[PDB]
Amino acid sequence: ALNWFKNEFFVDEWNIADVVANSENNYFTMASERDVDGTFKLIELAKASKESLKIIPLGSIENLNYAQEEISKSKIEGGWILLQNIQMSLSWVKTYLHKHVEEHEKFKMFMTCHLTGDKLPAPLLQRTDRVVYEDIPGILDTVKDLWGSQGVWSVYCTFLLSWFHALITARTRLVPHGFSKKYYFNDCDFQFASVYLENVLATNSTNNIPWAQVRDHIATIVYGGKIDEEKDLEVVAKLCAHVFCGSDNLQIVPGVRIPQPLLQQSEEEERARLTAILSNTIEPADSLSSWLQLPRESILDYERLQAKEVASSTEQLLQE
């Protein structure tokens, strides 16, 4: 019901690439909460646009002087530059950065701050475009994003790994029943799991895929490192056993079935077939419950609380 307004009246949305490619300002500020970062998004975006980032974290006087010198140099000849955790240098931001922004054509500067941190100065913040980086909440949208970011078995295992990452990132945002604490699995875990899958498929040319090894390594080493409690490890192992069971038929979603690749295909047609079988999937309204294999009570309570909060806030908003 909440997404009905967005999907009915509004026909477009902008990601970070769209807002950085359609803004006249040379300065951008991205805010993110604790235990989430968006630096890799900037790295991939700069790689796509064929430009070099100068990552300059703040917090020390030497880094402040280096940032001043690099800002002057990049205003002289060009090039991008990025500032990490600018709230650690509040005095520098208040004086030098404010004076510089207040006072080239291929020069853009990105600043990353924390939403729960100290208050940034209003005159600086209003003079720069603002982006908020959050993980995409939809499951199928997350699968599509992870697939579009990217023998045939490597591609198929990448597809299954993207599905597993989307499932676990969807499950990790349900506090009392999905897990025990607030675990957040960033892109580094996905990259490490993909490297492990490539290494396993490279060292095993017999095509007898050791799915037990992949299951244990993913559920214990890669995605199980941050897991602290025993029951969270058990549920991660259950999810990895459901996804990486290694069978010809694999119904990870009650409406999506992935046939295993055959021994006569190439990577291009395999990627096309997997994209085609991903495109036909229609996400139901109960995809937060049926896809994650959870009882309806917890999902219903969470959705009801979210709906009550958003409706009360917009009712308080509309009256004035």
Nearer to another protein, 206 or 264 (CB): 206
Q: Among 52, 203, 205, 316, which residue interacts with another protein (rule: CB under 8 A)?
A: 203
Nearer to another protein, 23 or 39 (CB): 39
41 binds another protein (CB under 8 A): no
113 binds another protein (CB under 8 A): no
> At its nearest, how many Å lie between another protein and the CB of residue 92?
11
What residues contact 303, with CB distance under 8 A and at least 6 apart? 288
User: x-or-dash pattern for another protein, window 69-98, by CB under 8 A?
Assistant: ---------------xx--x------x--x
Q: Among 78, 137, 148, 225, which residue interacts with another protein (rule: CB under 8 A)?
A: 225
186 binds another protein (CB under 8 A): yes
Total residues in contact with another protein, by rule CB under 8 A: 43
Q: Among 58, 124, 157, 258, which residue interacts with another protein (rule: CB under 8 A)?
A: 58
209 binds another protein (CB under 8 A): no
39 binds another protein (CB under 8 A): yes
Q: Among 60, 260, 266, 306, which residue interacts with another protein (rule: CB under 8 A)?
A: 60
Nearer to another protein, 153 or 302 (CB): 153
